[PDB]
Amino acid sequence: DGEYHSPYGDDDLYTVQPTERSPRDPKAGEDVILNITTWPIENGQDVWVEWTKNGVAQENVTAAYDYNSGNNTYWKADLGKFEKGDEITYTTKGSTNGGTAYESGPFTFYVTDWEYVQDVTSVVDNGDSITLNMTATAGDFSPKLYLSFEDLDTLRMELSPTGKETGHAGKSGYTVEDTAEKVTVTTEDLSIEIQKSPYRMEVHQADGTLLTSEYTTANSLGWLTDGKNVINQYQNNFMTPSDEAFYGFGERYDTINQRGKDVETYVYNEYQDQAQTERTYLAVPFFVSANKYGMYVNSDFHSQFQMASKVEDKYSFVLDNDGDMTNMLDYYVISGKDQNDIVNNYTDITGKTTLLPKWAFGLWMSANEWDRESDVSSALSNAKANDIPATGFVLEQWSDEETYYIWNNATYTAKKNGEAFSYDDFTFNGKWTDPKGMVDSVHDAGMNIVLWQVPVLKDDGTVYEQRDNDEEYMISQGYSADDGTGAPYRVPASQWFGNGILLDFTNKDAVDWWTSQREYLLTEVGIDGFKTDGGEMVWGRDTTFSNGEKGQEMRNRYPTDYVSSYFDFAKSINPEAVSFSRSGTSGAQKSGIYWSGDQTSTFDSFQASLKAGLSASTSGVSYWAWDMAGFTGDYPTAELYKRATAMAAFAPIMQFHSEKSDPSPSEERSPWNAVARTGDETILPTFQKYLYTRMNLLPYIYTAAKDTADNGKSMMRQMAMDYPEDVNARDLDEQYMFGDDLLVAPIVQEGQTEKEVYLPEGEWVDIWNGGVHPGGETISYYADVDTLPVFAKAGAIIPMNMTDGYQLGQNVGNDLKSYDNLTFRVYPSGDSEYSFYDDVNGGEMRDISVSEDFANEKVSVDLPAMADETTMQVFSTEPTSVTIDGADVAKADTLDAFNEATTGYYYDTVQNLTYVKAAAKDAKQAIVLNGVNHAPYEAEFGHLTNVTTASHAGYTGTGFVAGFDAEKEAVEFDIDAVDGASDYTMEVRYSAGVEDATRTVYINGKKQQITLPKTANWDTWNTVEVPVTLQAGNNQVVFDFEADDTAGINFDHVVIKK
Ligand SMILES: [Mg+2]
Ligand SMILES: [Mg+2]
Ligand SMILES: [Mg+2]
Ligand SMILES: [Mg+2]
Ligand SMILES: [Mg+2]
Ligand SMILES: [Mg+2]
Ligand SMILES: [Mg+2]
Ligand SMILES: [Mg+2]
């Protein structure tokens, strides 16, 4: 028998327990209902509420029955409505036939209402901080708003509604212009304009361009208070034009642009339907606007961002508080040199990404089904047999599934008083007879291993000696958080690891103990990190932590305290250790890899994963992964597996994984198992091509990883991060930039082969074949299931690790300590520079500079001192000569000859790349390619009409356009002016062995006829020069066979030169 009421239940954002108070935190004028339960169901029950209002006893309120369920009756007591300031204290009670009363409480609530800033009454300039003394719209407080500069381009606002707290100092490099009606604060990067009556702030760039501004009607900034004991929420409101896009907010699965949505900063473990429910494991109260600013609300409490979700030209944040009147609202408006610089300034505030060892950037292999030594040896043999040189290996199903720090099947004499075990305390049996040996085999294969962990001590009621011993110790030492009544906090019964006791990661002694238990795994077993799963486990309004903080504040922070604790611990013993986790908040980026969680093997889930990675990127989480092709649901189709593999190879972290613990047939998302499950053998060569290409690009990828750590630039970025003004790039979620120079456009729609790619202004070159694409339009690229459109930006310098074959997709292995052929792929366009992180050679910075001078038929490269021999691959026509420090280097006729030479150059006719080999030197080397022009525009890659392609020796590219000999046929080119609007010479290379031919050429609609003289035979190519006038952007150059034209031609390419 009993009674029960608990006003906040588990304080879940999305649901309510059936015995809560509603609303949980009443405001003035809201009817207050108390839901109460009694058991068992019996006639003669009475349920009532004994209470006081402002210390005065009120008449008891009788509860009315609502419904019965199971063994219980549910009741509703209506306390009515209250006024701001009312302090209500109540006790709910239940009795049957006037007998023993059962009760809950007492519980107290303070009725609140909103107060807003009215006017600025005075401004005090303290040199490193500015205080705005304010009046309020209601109540008796004397609010103060403090302004400070974290940097000259980053403004910090700290509001003290009572005025009793003081803001923090910042930079002194500002000037103030204060008048009766307005105060303007200026730095070399910002102009902050503040009207005083009513108070209203506008933030502008130094040049006057508006970034952000408080909502037009003012009274935008407020706090929710009873006017005495508590402040429960804060808010601010801002004006936003219809076109403004909002990115970030942590890891979001529904959309990359949150305009129109109410975004909750609340970590949550949502299985599979994250997009549909709009939930996430990793929530950050930071967004970046394409209007060139970021906003960061500095608080771990839940916040709701209403992004034009209620009023079409308004966005607001509503931030929660635990009632403490001394907690100031603290937020930043962040500007910078560009959008990526905004993210960098945000990481200055919340923490830089920690560079991880290079092994983290190779392929990670995982499968929950791997649960014994024979599975590991088979996984390693399968990888080798299938030429899959991975670098990472994860074990999830490795432990006893009780303590989670002991190997499955291991025997030992249980320990009391939380004493740690050493390797020798165990007798290893069955599934893991030699864990150290098993780890040694993984290392021998060139891989590093991580073990799965959770932040909770299991307690499902079953008896298990060691776990029961650890629980007793943990409770006696206070290593758990407190439920608010002196007992250990336990995860709600219905959740994952329900009834389990969380380790209080805010308690250093608790963290030292918990980690001491896992110490032997690092010191003796030799592991390389932990896959720290979970952490979205803090519920309860009264849950209390060692740092004095409670549930509201700690829910979002807990996962990051947990993840960071393990990351730091592992790295303290093994400097190469890496963490792999899913949950966190601001600051998550300091502690390893984040994967997108539990999704299904579908194209819809693939789309959501990409959105998750792009939003996480904007939020400063750059080292991001996903379970390629999904970890559960029906096995992926060959098409999905291939599409996912391509994107995964061009993502920050590449990793396959699977959910099922013991399936038949295997559920591994490995390439060999994918061939077996789908029967499609072609999956293997396709996976190999992408894995090999990733390893060929490892030098470029790892330099990008270092740039994230140093400059805050995420590895994979949504298009508007690099092109915020470009209206075409605002909502793109099926393409992205990878590193500084590659535009990647994965195919994420089932059955799609015609892929739209938006190309920003500039010139983009297909990295696989040399196809040229002028920017400023959306192109349609034919991409079969094995193809991934990837383009290099104009001026790109891309370091690669190549084999003697020198093509992308050739297996260089997984050696992380040396290069095979260190190569720099270059797409010359003006003067460009690149800073290479030569980690193989001590981590030295190598500054490479390229100077394109096609107007004078030259391209120069300034190669700094290098420890290794270097190969340049420069996109251009064939040079007449190549010099290194003024001396000519020998021309190699074949690739074999090039590989034999110690210095020299070779021209790759298929790729239109000039290879130049330079020996290792403790001094700079000046390389100059002479007689070179912009690489040809291959006829064979143009837009063809009623004509097809074919492949006579001596041609450039893959062949030429053939059967161009009848009216209505056409070959169209998208051509770029090499140096802006001007007259140029267009070389037309063709063969006409049977007769003189003529074609009519249109240059941006302007017609001219050209004559192509007979060649000796079809094996004799010839080039005719044609004067043309090109302008900025894409020049449409059409070659038509019209009424008055004649003869057959084979058409190889066109070259644009001075
Ligand atoms: Mg900065
Ligand atoms: Mg197994
Ligand atoms: Mg080691
Ligand atoms: Mg304590
Ligand atoms: Mg869509
Ligand atoms: Mg120049
Ligand atoms: Mg060699
Ligand atoms: Mg050709």
Automatic annotation (TrEMBL):
Residues given in the record as Mg(2+) 1 binding sites: N345
Occurrences of domain CBM6 (ranges): 935-1057
Residues reported in the UniProt entry to bind Mg(2+) 4: D815, S818
Protein name, entry field: Lmo2446 protein
Organism of provenance: Listeria monocytogenes serovar 1/2a (strain ATCC BAA-679 / EGD-e)
Molecular-function annotations in GO: carbohydrate binding; hydrolase activity, hydrolyzing O-glycosyl compounds; metal ion binding
Keyword Hydrolase among UniProt keywords: yes
PROSITE patterns, per the entry: CBM6, PROKAR_LIPOPROTEIN
Residues that hold Ca(2+) according to the record: E938, E940, T956, G959, D1052
UniProt binding sites for Mg(2+) 2: N345, D348
Source organism superkingdom: Bacteria
